[PDB]
Ligand SMILES: COC(=O)[C@H](Cc1cccc(C(N)=[NH2+])c1)[C@@H](C)NC(=O)c1ccc(-c2cc[n+]([O-])cc2)cc1
């Protein structure tokens with residue numbers, strides 16, 4: 643159930659609050675409009691292998 | 695690194711390298727931010743004066759992405775014990791900021807609960823560095839990486855000749871000739887989750903390298919996230 647089921651569909655951090663899933667991101671990312679995906683705030687976000 | 699593969703271009707951008715006054719890398723590190731490098735406390739003992747080098751992949755050709763940085767502040771864990779290697783964590787504040795480019799980017803710091811339950815329960819993590827290639831061999835000129843399986847706490851506590859404190863966890867192989875090694879310490883242990891790599895450990899120690907019946911020991915970074923967090927605001 644919840645964060646136990648495929649990370650709750652979150653790109654990164656998953657939190658279960660009040661029997662529901664709440665997603666979050668590391669510093670340098672902002673929660674997407676769907677409340678699950680994490681969008682980099684600038685170039686070279688953390689944890690990303692450099693593509694250029 | 696014993697076994698494993700070479701870190702290809704831009705593959706291990708968070709790797710940092712502690713170098714001594716004689717320009718020889720002696721320990722590794724993980725870029726945490728433009729100003730902070732995470733490493734092993736026991737490393738701050740391996741050199742009189744040292745600096746941090748980022749963006750390096752081959753200690754034999756000045757490619758151009760490299761950058762040597764001076765340490766302004768070194769924040770060692772107050773409770774670090776040299777005899778047991780307990781509390782083997784340290785943070786280095788660099789005089790000048792790190793410019794993120796190809797082969798230079800930080801690793802993400804995870805949140806404790808999510809990390810231990812979702813990240814550390816994954817099959818593997820990744821370990822890198824310029825450490826020795828063989829338990830009895832010279833250090834490496836090429837930055838290497840190794841996929842190291844998470845080892846069951848019990849099977850590890852059992853496999854070790856010494857105490858596995860709560861500030862340590864294990865990864866590696868029992869028989870397979872793959873493991874971190876001297877020179878890799880302080881280096882990064884990350885875990886990939888959906889194309890994003892999170893810092894999950896710090897190469898700490900091990901009995902020799904790639905030894906049968908022995909593993910590699912890493913500092914449990916999830917246990918020091920509030921500490922790292924604090925050290926980065928000072
Ligand atoms: C060639 O061998 C090496 O480089 C080893 C160091 C080392 C560094 C980084 C990674 C690994 C690894 N994952 N195998 C291993 C080698 C010099 N180290 C040891 O024998 C060694 C390391 C710790 C303890 C030890 C002693 C007392 N307590 O209480 C805890 C641990 C005893 C022996």
Ligand SMILES: [Ca+2]
Pocket residue numbers: 750751752753754755756757758760
């Ligand atoms: Ca180089």
